[PDB]
Design a protein around this ligand. Structure first.
Ligand SMILES: CC(C)(C)CC(C)(C)c1ccc(OCCOCCOCCOCCOCCOCCOCCOCCOCCO)cc1
Ligand SMILES: CC(C)(C)CC(C)(C)c1ccc(OCCOCCOCCOCCOCCOCCOCCOCCOCCO)cc1
Lengths: 326, 326
């Protein structure tokens, strides 16, 4: 059964929402209240909404986000809003945030706009969305491809931006479309690591999967390849019995750079189920990345461009026969 | 000195933000992190940003808002996102939220869209933005008019919506442009109040101003017209010595409707510095609204259309010589 959405930003609008809901007693409503404000009156009507809707959510907004008024403003009110406004010469944002925060961008038409990579999604070129795995209408992959094509077109054409920073050296970017300056921005510093010959031990680390059905495969991989440590994925909710979990406030990239400087003679091996962090770390000194492709998973668990990016990057892809591990 | 804005939604993007900031040591940055997630890693890098930026803000987002991925998603990840997605048959929102949440609307291209009034701002017709008080370039009023013209054009033309609900009976709406059905939605029920002849006392209530420079004028008005009570504005931070403040979880409209039913013989008088709530309450039984126009304020404290709306609505405008009150 489909749902109806209601979006409100004042109390009277919530009263209007209630009237609409009551005229449609047979329909499902999710109601979102957005406000910069907090008080007893807002709570009373929001609680009524909570009681009456299938789902209700209060979405707090930073004070001063809205430059408009639901009421007719006085001169005093116009003046306050006009000088709270920071004067904005430039805005930097992820390339796909040109889609998601386009309405805010449009309120600063004279600002210079520059983008940076969203992440490894920038590495899938336009043409890849046109084959054969994205080709069957109705499918989840087709719908994905259609969404991405539409998003990149918006990012590349609206709210013109004149430079794009990429953190990926030597892989073509979806934003490299000749309408902006491409600038490589090395995120990580490797000079001054002072890394030497690998005459010390070997330290093996598995990059944990945020996907809970990968738990047994992960444990099997650790046993099979003798991997002592796991770097848990930020969005991972489980542990790997018989593997030591690394606990650190750093992202894996910074953690490894810190370890290299501390242990300039240690061989570091990073094993991964095609994690995007691999693509940033392949060029670190004394670091050796291996992608694991478990035989029990379908060929299409990963999108085809993933296999190609890993190979273009010089990262070995290892068949892992996980059913041969107890 | 103008500022630069940075918008981030991942940790690696915050690292990119830091690099950009460090290359511009002489410039001012405000950085916004938007995330659905919370953890120690996000905090570490956000705290670095806090340390390095002039201003930094974490803007929490509801889980599942973003249908895209900064990384290349697996089949499992595509599946999870595809079925968290509520199927949406219709979206109701304030007319100007068609501008502010346009990017979200665009992700539901087959949903039926209906709007309702933002508030009294709907009562200023297109033509009013074209005269003479909005006419001098560079001014705050010109910039306001330009913004509103642009916003209403977007609301009226993009993401077509087929009906608009107004709570204002007998005042023309900016959205009544022949491209949608106008529907009057009476917010308040007045039958069943069972209000009778005004044979009881008179209760006078001043609607408080959210503007702190109105404190003395408000106190003067209360003394001058013998107003016993003030209904504080939701966004009002001060009190009126010698006036009883009403304390209620209801908006003034509901509060008065409750009082009328309880006291069907009482004359209620509402005094206001052109508050928009007056426009909803003029038609309540046993309620008499008076707008107060203090002589000490400039003629242009209120926008010209305000005076006209109050008169079209049958609301007396009373000159208040506030300098004649001690
Ligand atoms: C405190 C501050 C705002 C000065 C700090 C500043 C400038 C750094 C800042 C912090 C955080 C920011 O977040 C970016 C976007 O966040 C998404 C919020 O969805 C908005 C929902 O609105 C509902 C209320 O609609 C009222 C009607 O409006 C109509 C006019 O709208 C014009 C479009 O502007 C709306 C902003 O668009 C939001 C998303 O792009 C943006 C800017
Ligand atoms: C839990 C739930 C989401 C399922 C509930 C649901 C559906 C009722 C709901 C609750 C609350 C809602 O708020 C509406 C808008 O709020 C403003 C948030 O500014 C967004 C900032 O994004 C930064 C991350 O960009 C990542 C890149 O993306 C690119 C693709 O974007 C396509 C455009 O979609 C973005 C949504 O646009 C937001 C404002 O319109 C909307 C919907």
């Amino acid at each position: 059964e489909p749902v109806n959405l209601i979006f409100c930003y004042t109390i009277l609008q919530m009263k209007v929402a209630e009237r609409i809901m009551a005229q449609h007693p047979g329909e499902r409503f999710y109601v979102v209240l957005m406000s910069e404000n907090r008080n007893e009156k807002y709570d009373y009507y929001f609680n009524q909404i909570k009681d009456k809707a299938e789902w209700a959510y209060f979405f707090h907004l930073p004070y001063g986000l809205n430059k408009s008024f639901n009421f007719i403003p006085t001169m005093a009110e116009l003046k306050v809003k006009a000088m709270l406004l920071p004067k904005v010469k430039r805005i930097y944002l992820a390339s796909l945030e040109k889609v998601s925060i386009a309405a805010f961008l449009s309120t600063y038409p004279d600002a210079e706009i520059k983008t940076f990579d969203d992440g490894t999604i920038n590495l899938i070129q336009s043409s890849s969305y046109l084959g054969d795995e994205f080709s069957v209408n109705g499918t989840i992959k087709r719908n994905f491809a259609r969404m991405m094509i539409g998003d990149w077109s918006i990012a590349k054409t609206r709210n013109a931006s004149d430079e794009h920073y990429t953190i990926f050296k030597g892989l073509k970017n979806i934003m490299d479309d000749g309408r902006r300056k491409m600038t490589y921005l090395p995120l990580f510093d490797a000079s001054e690591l002072k890394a030497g010959d690998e005459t010390g031990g070997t330290v093996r680390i598995l990059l944990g999967s945020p996907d809970k059905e990968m738990k047994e495969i992960s444990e099997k991989a650790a046993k099979n390849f003798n991997i002592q440590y796991v770097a848990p994925h930020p969005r991972q909710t489980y542990g790997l019995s018989g593997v030591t979990t690394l606990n650190s406030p750093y992202v894996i990239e910074d953690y490894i750079l810190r370890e290299i400087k501390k242990n300039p003679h240690t061989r570091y091996e990073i094993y991964t189920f095609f994690s995007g962090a691999a693509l940033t770390m392949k060029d670190f000194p004394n670091v050796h990345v291996y992608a694991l492709k478990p035989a029990s998973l379908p060929e299409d668990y990963w999108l085809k461009p993933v296999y190609a990016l890993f190979t273009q990057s010089g990262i070995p892809i290892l068949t892992f026969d996980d059913k041969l591990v107890p």
